Design a protein around this motif. Structure first.
Motif, mmCIF file in Angstrom:
data_model
loop_
_atom_site.group_PDB
_atom_site.id
_atom_site.type_symbol
_atom_site.label_atom_id
_atom_site.label_comp_id
_atom_site.label_asym_id
_atom_site.label_seq_id
_atom_site.Cartn_x
_atom_site.Cartn_y
_atom_site.Cartn_z
ATOM 1 N N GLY B 1 0.709 -1.355 0.010
ATOM 2 C CA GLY B 1 -0.064 -0.058 0.009
ATOM 3 C C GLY B 1 0.745 1.353 -0.050
ATOM 4 O O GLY B 1 0.562 2.312 0.684
ATOM 5 N N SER B 2 2.129 0.983 -0.682
ATOM 6 C CA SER B 2 2.878 2.443 -0.903
ATOM 7 C C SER B 2 2.380 3.247 -1.991
ATOM 8 O O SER B 2 3.126 4.345 -2.229
ATOM 9 N N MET B 3 1.043 3.163 -2.410
ATOM 10 C CA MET B 3 0.734 3.961 -3.398
ATOM 11 C C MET B 3 -0.747 4.086 -3.300
ATOM 12 O O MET B 3 -1.662 4.402 -4.350
ATOM 13 N N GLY B 4 -1.432 4.243 -2.049
ATOM 14 C CA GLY B 4 -2.665 4.647 -1.824
ATOM 15 C C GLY B 4 -2.908 6.243 -2.421
ATOM 16 O O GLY B 4 -4.168 6.320 -2.892
ATOM 17 N N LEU B 5 -2.029 7.044 -2.587
ATOM 18 C CA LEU B 5 -2.168 8.200 -3.320
ATOM 19 C C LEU B 5 -2.405 8.114 -4.698
ATOM 20 O O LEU B 5 -3.286 9.017 -5.217
ATOM 21 N N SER B 6 -1.700 7.339 -5.230
ATOM 22 C CA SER B 6 -2.002 7.080 -6.547
ATOM 23 C C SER B 6 -3.415 6.519 -6.848
ATOM 24 O O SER B 6 -4.108 6.934 -7.937
ATOM 25 N N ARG B 7 -3.924 5.801 -5.766
ATOM 26 C CA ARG B 7 -5.221 5.171 -6.188
ATOM 27 C C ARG B 7 -6.110 6.373 -5.739
ATOM 28 O O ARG B 7 -7.442 6.450 -6.564
ATOM 29 N N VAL B 8 -5.938 7.232 -5.057
ATOM 30 C CA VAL B 8 -7.005 8.425 -4.645
ATOM 31 C C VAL B 8 -6.989 9.472 -5.872
ATOM 32 O O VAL B 8 -7.843 9.674 -6.434
ATOM 33 N N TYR B 9 -5.674 9.609 -6.438
ATOM 34 C CA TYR B 9 -5.717 10.302 -7.558
ATOM 35 C C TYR B 9 -6.254 9.834 -8.810
ATOM 36 O O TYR B 9 -7.139 10.365 -9.683
ATOM 37 N N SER B 10 -6.139 8.446 -9.215
ATOM 38 C CA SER B 10 -6.886 7.890 -10.008
ATOM 39 C C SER B 10 -8.388 7.770 -9.910
ATOM 40 O O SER B 10 -9.048 8.056 -10.788
ATOM 41 N N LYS B 11 -8.785 7.681 -8.625
ATOM 42 C CA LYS B 11 -10.280 7.650 -8.377
ATOM 43 C C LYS B 11 -10.884 9.156 -8.806
ATOM 44 O O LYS B 11 -11.929 9.396 -9.170
ATOM 45 N N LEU B 12 -10.135 10.180 -8.107
ATOM 46 C CA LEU B 12 -10.673 11.450 -8.403
ATOM 47 C C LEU B 12 -10.737 12.020 -9.819
ATOM 48 O O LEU B 12 -11.660 12.441 -10.458
ATOM 49 N N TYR B 13 -9.511 11.664 -10.644
ATOM 50 C CA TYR B 13 -9.695 11.542 -12.252
ATOM 51 C C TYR B 13 -11.097 11.019 -12.625
ATOM 52 O O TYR B 13 -11.809 11.803 -13.445
ATOM 53 N N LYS B 14 -11.232 9.857 -12.421
ATOM 54 C CA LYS B 14 -12.701 9.142 -12.834
ATOM 55 C C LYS B 14 -13.771 9.750 -12.353
ATOM 56 O O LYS B 14 -14.845 10.389 -13.467
ATOM 57 N N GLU B 15 -14.032 10.335 -11.163
ATOM 58 C CA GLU B 15 -15.089 11.008 -10.868
ATOM 59 C C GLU B 15 -15.203 12.360 -11.514
ATOM 60 O O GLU B 15 -16.518 12.845 -11.761
ATOM 61 N N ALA B 16 -14.160 13.266 -11.602
ATOM 62 C CA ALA B 16 -14.135 14.418 -12.422
ATOM 63 C C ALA B 16 -14.651 14.187 -13.765
ATOM 64 O O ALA B 16 -15.493 14.973 -14.278
ATOM 65 N N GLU B 17 -14.176 13.161 -14.338
ATOM 66 C CA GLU B 17 -14.913 12.734 -15.733
ATOM 67 C C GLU B 17 -16.484 12.532 -15.451
ATOM 68 O O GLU B 17 -17.022 13.135 -16.664
ATOM 69 N N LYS B 18 -16.802 11.665 -14.723
ATOM 70 C CA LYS B 18 -18.268 11.626 -14.751
ATOM 71 C C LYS B 18 -18.783 12.818 -14.269
ATOM 72 O O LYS B 18 -20.068 12.913 -14.884
ATOM 73 N N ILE B 19 -18.443 13.815 -13.710
ATOM 74 C CA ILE B 19 -19.273 14.934 -13.324
ATOM 75 C C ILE B 19 -19.194 15.740 -14.402
ATOM 76 O O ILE B 19 -20.129 16.459 -14.841
ATOM 77 N N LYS B 20 -17.913 16.060 -15.324
ATOM 78 C CA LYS B 20 -18.143 16.984 -16.455
ATOM 79 C C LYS B 20 -19.082 16.206 -17.430
ATOM 80 O O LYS B 20 -19.882 17.097 -17.935
ATOM 81 N N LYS B 21 -19.225 14.878 -17.714
ATOM 82 C CA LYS B 21 -19.949 14.166 -18.563
ATOM 83 C C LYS B 21 -21.499 14.460 -18.053
ATOM 84 O O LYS B 21 -22.406 15.021 -18.937
ATOM 85 N N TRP B 22 -21.700 14.695 -16.770
ATOM 86 C CA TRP B 22 -23.260 14.854 -16.237
ATOM 87 C C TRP B 22 -23.304 16.328 -16.488
ATOM 88 O O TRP B 22 -24.509 16.663 -17.113
ATOM 89 N N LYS B 23 -22.389 17.402 -16.395
ATOM 90 C CA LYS B 23 -22.744 18.713 -16.765
ATOM 91 C C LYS B 23 -23.279 18.686 -18.155
ATOM 92 O O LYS B 23 -24.188 19.555 -18.479
ATOM 93 N N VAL B 24 -22.416 18.174 -19.106
ATOM 94 C CA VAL B 24 -22.796 18.385 -20.485
ATOM 95 C C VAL B 24 -24.073 17.672 -20.698
ATOM 96 O O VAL B 24 -25.008 18.471 -21.428
ATOM 97 N N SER B 25 -24.309 16.646 -20.056
ATOM 98 C CA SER B 25 -25.797 16.058 -20.357
ATOM 99 C C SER B 25 -26.874 16.942 -19.937
ATOM 100 O O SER B 25 -27.919 17.015 -20.699
ATOM 101 N N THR B 26 -26.811 17.441 -18.655
ATOM 102 C CA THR B 26 -28.002 18.088 -18.027
ATOM 103 C C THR B 26 -28.244 19.330 -18.725
ATOM 104 O O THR B 26 -29.222 19.890 -18.888
#
Lengths: 76, 76, 76, 76
Positions: B1-26
């Motif tokens: 677990g020497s890369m917890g922050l890389s996993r946080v980082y990757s998760k945040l990227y994916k959520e930002a993409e989902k939110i941007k996509k939601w914005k466009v859609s709505t």
């Protein structure tokens, strides 16, 4: 035949009576025909003016119906 | 677990993409609803004025028919 | 700068709050636009059927007026 | 005055001529009055039937106008 003139005289009297009676009769019928003719002229003039007024009315009704049709037909 | 922050980082990227996509859609759906609402206001105002004109016409036709009845009924 | 992650954390919290608030706002407006669209469809269908009935009536009135004209015009 | 009867005779002849002439005259006028009376009866019956037909027509027109008013007034 000692009284031929009395027979002429009597015959002339009877003919004068028949002619007088004819005069009375024919004049009376003339006055009645004239009377009813005058009545007829009144009735005929009356009916003439009546028909005139009725036909004038029908022309007025026709103009109103035509106006109503114009108004209605703009809507269709 | 020497890369917890890389996993946080990757998760945040994916959520930002989902939110941007939601914005466009709505937003896109909002513009479409607004567009069709504006269209609706146009249609509704159009139909309102149409009904108004039709009813005004029916009043005019009624007056003409009443006039025609008056004219006709004097004749009877 | 021994607390960079605390600052990241605080920033992420604030952005999540702004996004949640945006969600509430945009959904609520969507429901209101949809609601008023549905109302609009009702009004539009109502007015359509109304105009239909009015025009059908005007055709019936036209036939009656035409009949009245025929009857009247035979008289002239 | 040895010819009184010739004078009676001549007078009677003249009166017979006047009476015959009167007969011709009055009969001729009777036939003319009767003729024109018969003409009058024809005209009067003609106009009567005409007025009858016109008034019957006006009743038919009235019913049509009433129907048109009913139809129109449901629309208002």
């Amino acid at each position: 035949g000692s009284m031929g003139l009395s027979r002429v005289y009597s015959k002339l009297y009877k003919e004068a009576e028949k002619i007088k009676k004819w005069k009375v009769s024919t004049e009376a019928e003339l006055r009645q025909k004239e009377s009813k003719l005058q009545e007829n002229r009144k009735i005929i003039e009356a009916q003439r003016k009546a028909i005139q007024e009725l036909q004038f009315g029908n022309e007025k009704v026709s103009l109103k119906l035509e106006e109503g049709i114009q108004e209605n037909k703009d809507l269709i």
